[PDB]
Design a protein around this nucleic acid. Sequence first.
DNA 1: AGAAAGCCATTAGAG
DNA 2: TCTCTAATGGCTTTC
Length: 56
Amino acid sequence: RQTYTRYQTLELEKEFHFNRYLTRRRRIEIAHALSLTERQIKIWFQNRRMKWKKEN
DNA sequence: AGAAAGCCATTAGAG
DNA sequence: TCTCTAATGGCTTTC
C-alpha cells in the first residue's frame, strides 16, 4: 500500500471539484504530473465518488 | 461482441 | 487499539 502525499491528495481533490469523472486524456496527464499509475487515479476517483454519495 | 470503466462491499496496511 | 483509505474482486454498464 502506498500513502499519498498531501500534495498528491490536494491536486486530486482540486480536480474532483471540477470533474467527478475523468477523461482518458485527463487521467493520463494527472497520472504523470503526480507520478501515480492510471490505475491509481482511476481507483482514487472510484473511492472519492463513493465517499461523496455517502458524505453529501 | 468485447474491451474498458464504473459501482459496491469489503479487506488490510500505515500512522 | 483504532482510524482512515489504498486496493481488491465480482458484477454491471458504457462504447
